Design an enzyme around this catalytic site. Structure first.
Site, PDB file in Angstrom:
ATOM      1  N   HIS B  65       0.854  -1.216   0.000  1.00  0.00           N
ATOM      2  CA  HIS B  65       0.000   0.000   0.000  1.00  0.00           C
ATOM      3  C   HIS B  65       0.886   1.261   0.000  1.00  0.00           C
ATOM      4  O   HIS B  65       0.452   2.273  -0.588  1.00  0.00           O
ATOM      5  CB  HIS B  65      -1.031  -0.099   1.139  1.00  0.00           C
ATOM      6  CG  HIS B  65      -1.924  -1.290   1.010  1.00  0.00           C
ATOM      7  ND1 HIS B  65      -2.677  -1.528  -0.129  1.00  0.00           N
ATOM      8  CD2 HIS B  65      -2.165  -2.313   1.858  1.00  0.00           C
ATOM      9  CE1 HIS B  65      -3.350  -2.652   0.032  1.00  0.00           C
ATOM     10  NE2 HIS B  65      -3.064  -3.135   1.249  1.00  0.00           N
ATOM     11  N   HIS B  94       6.579   6.690   6.026  1.00  0.00           N
ATOM     12  CA  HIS B  94       5.970   6.190   4.777  1.00  0.00           C
ATOM     13  C   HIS B  94       5.576   7.335   3.866  1.00  0.00           C
ATOM     14  O   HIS B  94       5.678   8.520   4.232  1.00  0.00           O
ATOM     15  CB  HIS B  94       4.841   5.215   5.069  1.00  0.00           C
ATOM     16  CG  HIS B  94       3.804   5.796   5.950  1.00  0.00           C
ATOM     17  ND1 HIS B  94       3.829   5.631   7.318  1.00  0.00           N
ATOM     18  CD2 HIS B  94       2.735   6.561   5.668  1.00  0.00           C
ATOM     19  CE1 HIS B  94       2.773   6.229   7.848  1.00  0.00           C
ATOM     20  NE2 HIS B  94       2.066   6.811   6.857  1.00  0.00           N
ATOM     21  N   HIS B  96       3.147   8.709   0.479  1.00  0.00           N
ATOM     22  CA  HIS B  96       1.885   8.783  -0.264  1.00  0.00           C
ATOM     23  C   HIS B  96       2.158   9.628  -1.486  1.00  0.00           C
ATOM     24  O   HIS B  96       2.717  10.729  -1.324  1.00  0.00           O
ATOM     25  CB  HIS B  96       0.803   9.359   0.651  1.00  0.00           C
ATOM     26  CG  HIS B  96       0.646   8.561   1.897  1.00  0.00           C
ATOM     27  ND1 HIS B  96      -0.222   7.467   1.983  1.00  0.00           N
ATOM     28  CD2 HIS B  96       1.177   8.735   3.123  1.00  0.00           C
ATOM     29  CE1 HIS B  96      -0.120   6.939   3.192  1.00  0.00           C
ATOM     30  NE2 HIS B  96       0.700   7.751   3.942  1.00  0.00           N
ATOM     31  N   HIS B 119       5.322  10.727   5.841  1.00  0.00           N
ATOM     32  CA  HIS B 119       4.849  10.658   7.247  1.00  0.00           C
ATOM     33  C   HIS B 119       5.919   9.994   8.088  1.00  0.00           C
ATOM     34  O   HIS B 119       6.210   8.811   7.862  1.00  0.00           O
ATOM     35  CB  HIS B 119       3.520   9.910   7.353  1.00  0.00           C
ATOM     36  CG  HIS B 119       2.382  10.661   6.770  1.00  0.00           C
ATOM     37  ND1 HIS B 119       1.206  10.044   6.402  1.00  0.00           N
ATOM     38  CD2 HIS B 119       2.241  11.979   6.463  1.00  0.00           C
ATOM     39  CE1 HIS B 119       0.395  10.955   5.915  1.00  0.00           C
ATOM     40  NE2 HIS B 119       0.995  12.178   5.963  1.00  0.00           N
ATOM     41  N   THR B 208      -4.106   7.413   8.921  1.00  0.00           N
ATOM     42  CA  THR B 208      -4.789   7.691   7.650  1.00  0.00           C
ATOM     43  C   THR B 208      -5.008   6.364   6.925  1.00  0.00           C
ATOM     44  O   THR B 208      -5.485   6.404   5.802  1.00  0.00           O
ATOM     45  CB  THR B 208      -4.028   8.693   6.763  1.00  0.00           C
ATOM     46  OG1 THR B 208      -2.799   8.088   6.373  1.00  0.00           O
ATOM     47  CG2 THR B 208      -3.804  10.021   7.431  1.00  0.00           C
ATOM     48  N   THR B 209      -4.606   5.250   7.515  1.00  0.00           N
ATOM     49  CA  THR B 209      -5.000   3.896   7.054  1.00  0.00           C
ATOM     50  C   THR B 209      -5.722   3.163   8.184  1.00  0.00           C
ATOM     51  O   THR B 209      -5.583   3.488   9.361  1.00  0.00           O
ATOM     52  CB  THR B 209      -3.767   3.141   6.560  1.00  0.00           C
ATOM     53  OG1 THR B 209      -2.799   3.056   7.600  1.00  0.00           O
ATOM     54  CG2 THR B 209      -3.123   3.815   5.371  1.00  0.00           C
TER      55      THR B 209
HETATM   56  N1  LIG Z   1      -0.316   7.085   7.199  1.00  0.00           N
HETATM   57  S1  LIG Z   1      -0.185   7.380   8.762  1.00  0.00           S
HETATM   58  O1  LIG Z   1      -1.379   7.969   9.181  1.00  0.00           O
HETATM   59  O2  LIG Z   1       1.030   8.109   8.955  1.00  0.00           O
HETATM   60  C1  LIG Z   1       0.017   5.845   9.622  1.00  0.00           C
HETATM   61  C2  LIG Z   1       1.079   5.696  10.499  1.00  0.00           C
HETATM   62  C3  LIG Z   1       1.292   4.473  11.125  1.00  0.00           C
HETATM   63  C4  LIG Z   1       0.442   3.400  10.885  1.00  0.00           C
HETATM   64  N2  LIG Z   1       0.683   2.153  11.512  1.00  0.00           N
HETATM   65  C5  LIG Z   1       1.730   1.825  12.341  1.00  0.00           C
HETATM   66  O3  LIG Z   1       2.654   2.585  12.590  1.00  0.00           O
HETATM   67  N3  LIG Z   1       1.655   0.537  12.802  1.00  0.00           N
HETATM   68  C6  LIG Z   1       2.485  -0.156  13.727  1.00  0.00           C
HETATM   69  C7  LIG Z   1       2.138  -1.455  14.103  1.00  0.00           C
HETATM   70  C8  LIG Z   1       2.884  -2.136  15.053  1.00  0.00           C
HETATM   71  C9  LIG Z   1       3.959  -1.497  15.619  1.00  0.00           C
HETATM   72  F1  LIG Z   1       4.606  -2.099  16.664  1.00  0.00           F
HETATM   73  C10 LIG Z   1       4.349  -0.235  15.256  1.00  0.00           C
HETATM   74  C11 LIG Z   1       3.600   0.440  14.305  1.00  0.00           C
HETATM   75  C12 LIG Z   1      -0.642   3.575  10.030  1.00  0.00           C
HETATM   76  C13 LIG Z   1      -0.852   4.792   9.389  1.00  0.00           C
HETATM   77 ZN   LIG Z   2       0.916   7.894   6.228  1.00  0.00          ZN
END
Ligand SMILES: NS(=O)(=O)c1ccc(NC(=O)Nc2ccc(F)cc2)cc1
Ligand SMILES: [Zn+2]
Ligand SMILES: NS(=O)(=O)c1ccc(NC(=O)Nc2ccc(F)cc2)cc1
Ligand SMILES: *[C@@H]1O[C@H](CO)[C@@H](O)[C@H](O)[C@H]1NC(C)=O
Ligand SMILES: *[C@@H]1O[C@H](CO)[C@@H](O)[C@H](O)[C@H]1NC(C)=O
Ligand SMILES: *[C@@H]1O[C@H](CO)[C@@H](O)[C@H](O)[C@H]1NC(C)=O
Ligand SMILES: *[C@@H]1O[C@H](CO)[C@@H](O)[C@H](O)[C@H]1NC(C)=O
Ligand SMILES: *[C@@H]1O[C@H](CO)[C@@H](O)[C@H](O)[C@H]1NC(C)=O
Lengths: 277, 277
Positions: B65, B94, B96, B119, B208-209
């Site tokens: 993604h 990440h 986008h 991000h 945002t996911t």
């Molecule tokens: N696109 S966003 O809003 O910046 C975003 C940032 C982080 C996540 N997810 C994430 O960081 N997951 C995670 C899962 C397990 C972990 F131990 C650490 C991070 C999803 C969307």
């Molecule tokens: Zn993001």
């Protein structure tokens, strides 16, 4: 371990012993300032409603810090939007009070303390399937704060204790922690009718006991419900848990927190509701 | 179970598939409106800083993604308060982007889309000892949004890809999900030096996911860092995961959310920061 009255485990220490989240900048309670707050006309009348199919029993516990009513699952609900579709489900109700009649509430209204503040705790069933899923998760909880004030002249039937059914007489010196007793159901709809359910403060904050989780949508009604000196003294008969310095339960409130401590990374706003004028 | 481009699992379905919390009213991204934001002079310059004695490897993954840089633990930090005491620990970065140069960013600035939004995801180590503890808990996360804009005339060394060390050449059609590759470290301090770290939007929002957890402290820098058309095209060679309809990774951004949907029970405010000047 935490307490209200043992200076070693007391509220001044929670920021260090429970940094998640008692060290946060969205803590509760706060001074509810009528002048500083933003009137938001979109905030509607609060409704409390029952599932008339529920038959399960209600209990009350001396947990060593408060008197805590535990409601059965799927029984009592809050609506903030006028629809009765079970978005908020009531879990428990607990109380904070003072050694003396001029304090006890956790919130203040323009600096003023009430003798007794009730907290009706609900979870956002709209999002979370169980209380234990909601309690630790973002946006999980909504709490109603009900201020109580002492009057000298009143019939029992117009006091809050009519809604509470006197807690089935459990508020006495022998109600020792961590004893739990079955009680008559609390008529929370009658309780809410004793005040103006359109007239309230609204803000995002926290649990007022460790771990002070910042996942509480607060609603604090401005108009108090009414009680007697005799009724406030029933709470004062409960014994504190063994980790408190004080023997009798009282002054079981957290000190006032700032709406926006200096270290905040995003200020919150205190809102106010009033009836469709 | 979710995608960007498959209408069965795409962003219009997340509020149904992931009610907790993609159905909420504190969602991201939002339109960052300069005119309908509140200037907060107390919001300080952002600092990103490295633990100079960390030696562990950085990876990047095509997760199907997005392209996701995964930082080793205890290595890169954010300070919002001028103190270098490891309050926010960077976990990952990440990206986008768009199929075309006129779109890609999640956030807009006065309705304007950038071609690429990075991000930088951190956990509030001040409260939570690990990322896995922080990511699901209230107030767990702080994300920096870095806008990128395309210029026709620039030296490689003044582009954002200099700070990324060109992702060590790893970005190509063969970099398939869920593969990861070791890369040279990202100089996030250089990256931040390419924009004005005092000039930003600030608000409380969400991932945002899915599951769109409402526990993100957002900071979106107003000034973009600069990239070339060749550099944006290196992202567009990545393939989407198999649950996507589109073959090539692109248009991997969530649609704009309202700051205050009509069902909100406590409005949030968009803040903005600028320099002591
Ligand atoms: N696109 S966003 O809003 O910046 C975003 C940032 C982080 C996540 N997810 C994430 O960081 N997951 C995670 C899962 C397990 C972990 F131990 C650490 C991070 C999803 C969307
Ligand atoms: Zn993001
Ligand atoms: N005093 S307060 O801020 O109203 C409050 C409200 C609720 C709690 N705690 C609570 O409800 N605990 C709980 C534990 C397990 C459950 F499944 C549900 C609730 C603590 C303080
Ligand atoms: C009402 O109570 C009944 C029986 O106790 C239960 O099966 C039903 O699910 C409850 N309704 C709600 C909305 O929780
Ligand atoms: C509650 O207490 C008062 C005072 O002793 C009494 O008059 C009243 O009937 C009691 N009610 C119930 C339901 O026990
Ligand atoms: C800095 O680096 C080393 C990495 O091995 C580690 O022992 C130390 O704890 C780190 N410091 C912080 C603040 O994470
Ligand atoms: C950057 O990496 C790409 C492959 O992703 C490569 O084709 C290009 O030459 C590299 N540029 C520099 C300046 O290292
Ligand atoms: C990254 O790739 C290697 C080599 O194929 C693999 O063994 C490693 O566990 C991967 N890391 C992941 C999936 O987190």
């Amino acid at each position: 371990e935490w307490s209200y009255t043992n200076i070693l485990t007391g509220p001044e220490t929670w920021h260090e012993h429970y940094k998640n989240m008692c060290s946060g900048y969205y803590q509760s309670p706060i001074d509810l300032k009528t002048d500083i707050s933003t009137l938001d006309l979109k905030l509607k009348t609060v409704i409390i409603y029952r599932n008339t199919s529920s038959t399960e029993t209600t209990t009350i516990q001396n947990n060593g810090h408060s008197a805590e009513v535990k409601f059965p699952r799927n029984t009592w609900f809050i609506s903030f939007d006028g629809i009765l579709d079970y978005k908020y489900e009531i879990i428990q109700m607990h109380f904070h009070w003072g050694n003396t009649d001029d304090r006890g509430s956790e919130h203040t209204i323009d600096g003023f303390r009430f003798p007794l503040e009730g907290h009706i705790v609900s979870f956002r069933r709209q999002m979370y399937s169980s209380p234990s899923e909601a309690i630790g998760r973002p946006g999980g909880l909504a709490v109603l704060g009900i201020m109580h004030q002492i009057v000298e002249s009143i019939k029992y039937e117009q006091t809050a204790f009519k809604a509470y059914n006197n807690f089935s007489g459990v508020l006495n010196s022998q109600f020792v922690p961590p004893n739990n007793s079955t009680i008559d159901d609390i008529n929370l709809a009658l309780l809410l009718s004793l005040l103006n359910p359109s007239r309230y403060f609204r803000y995002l904050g926290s649990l007022t006991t460790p771990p002070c989780t910042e996942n509480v949508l607060w609603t604090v009604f401005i108009d108090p419900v009414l009680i007697t000196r005799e009724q406030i003294n029933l709470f004062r008969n409960l014994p504190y848990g063994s980790n408190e310095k004080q023997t009798r339960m009282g002054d079981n409130f957290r000190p006032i927190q700032l709406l926006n401590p200096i270290d905040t990374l995003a200020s919150r706003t205190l809102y106010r509701a009033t009836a469709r004028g």
